[PDB]
Amino acid sequence: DRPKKVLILMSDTGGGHRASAEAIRAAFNQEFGDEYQVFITDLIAREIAQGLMKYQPDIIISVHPLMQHVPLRVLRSKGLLKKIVFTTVITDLSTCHPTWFHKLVTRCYCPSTEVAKRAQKAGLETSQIKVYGLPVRPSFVKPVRPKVELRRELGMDENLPAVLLMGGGEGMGPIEATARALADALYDKNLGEAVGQVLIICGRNKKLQSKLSSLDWKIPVQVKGFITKMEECMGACDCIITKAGPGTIAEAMIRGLPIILNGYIAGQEAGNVPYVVENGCGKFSKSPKEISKIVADWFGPASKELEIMSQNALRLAKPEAVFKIVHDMHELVRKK
């Protein structure tokens, strides 16, 4: 028809998830092309009012818990509410805050049926609620090379089972202690045999990255900084240790990785934990000793438990969330 503009509201503080926003932007790009131009704005009323005028969006998307009430008010203050489709993509996997929901919204996209039940609780009608899962980048969703080919490209051992350890960011138990604990649990002293291997992704924690990659490891340990392609990394491993950041969780499930939740950002990600644990996809622990035992058992005596949890994750996985959402927004905008 005519080119349309999309504004996605994030805020670097207060919860919510920008990787979902970027995932959404990439999905519009892939699916539709220049039929849509997509901006992500980090911001309250005056700024909203500003960004409204800067981008004059056809459709507004909120990936933030605080981005419903004020933006909607301002939309009604400027008579824009019937012109502009307003949508919410909840980035809390479970157990959310009431603010995620707003009756004046057009559509609210849920990552679980649990969250959707909460939307119904809030008075939103069936037309306003969809459950497609939590959006993940498309480039993540491409079926990936074989395990040994990924392992080799990442400098890992080809045969040992691997735990993905994420050390980036805030909220986790001791990463260095955890890696050392992992090395001890996965070494057979008499055999001189590594029982497993570790891949540590440091993200932006560079002090951790240098310390960990200067150590002498009992088992194969690969240390990295920032990784653009998480799909290759997750495809090379057999389980994952991480903070209950929602994207990382939704990614791991797509790759059938059983999760050890290493913690969470308080006030933000703690509702993600039951989504993992109560659904049979993983465990919680911050302790290095407790974590490494879990991995060591999953790589030996509880290996049946690992395979079962690995099936539970694929079953919960929704790799097509991103496409579904944007195709739904596409038709939402069109009915005008």
UniProtKB/Swiss-Prot annotation:
Shown stretch of the complete protein: 139 to 523 of 533
Disruption phenotype: Plants show defects in chloroplast biogenesis and a dwarf and albino phenotype. The amount of monogalactosyldiacylglycerol was reduced by 98% in the mutant leaves, indicating that MGD2 or MGD3 cannot compensate for loss of MGD1 function.
Highest taxon in the source lineage: Eukaryota
Tissue: Expressed in roots, stems, leaves, flowers, siliques and seeds.
Source species: Arabidopsis thaliana
Effect of residue 243 to R: Abolishes catalytic activity
List of residues binding UDP: 17, 137, 226-227, 247-251, 269
Quaternary structure note: Homodimer.
Gene Ontology molecular function, alphabetical: 1,2-diacylglycerol 3-beta-galactosyltransferase activity; UDP-galactosyltransferase activity; UDP-glycosyltransferase activity
Protein name per UniProt: Monogalactosyldiacylglycerol synthase 1, chloroplastic
Activity control: Activated by phosphatidate (PA) and phosphatidylglycerol (PG). Inhibited by galvestine-1.
Function, as annotated: Involved in the synthesis of the major structural component of photosynthetic membranes. Required for proper thylakoid membrane biogenesis. Does not discriminate between prokaryotic (18:1/16:0) or eukaryotic (18:2/18:2) 1,2-diacylglycerol species, but operates with some preference for the prokaryotic one. Is responsible for most galactolipid synthesis in chloroplasts. Required for the formation of thylakoid membranes and functional photosynthetic electron transport during cotyledons greening in young seedlings.
Reactions catalysed: a 1,2-diacyl-sn-glycerol + UDP-alpha-D-galactose = a 1,2-diacyl-3-O-(beta-D-galactosyl)-sn-glycerol + UDP + H(+); 1,2-di-(9Z,12Z-octadecadienoyl)-sn-glycerol + UDP-alpha-D-galactose = 1,2-di-(9Z,12Z-octadecadienoyl)-3-beta-D-galactosyl-sn-glycerol + UDP + H(+); 1-(9Z-octadecenoyl)-2-hexadecanoyl-sn-glycerol + UDP-alpha-D-galactose = 1-(9Z-octadecenoyl)-2-hexadecanoyl-3-beta-D-galactosyl-sn-glycerol + UDP + H(+); 1,2-di-(9Z-octadecenoyl)-sn-glycerol + UDP-alpha-D-galactose = 1,2-di-(9Z-octadecenoyl)-3-beta-D-galactosyl-sn-glycerol + UDP + H(+)
Enzyme class, broadest EC rank: transferase
Keyword Cell membrane appears in the UniProt entry: no
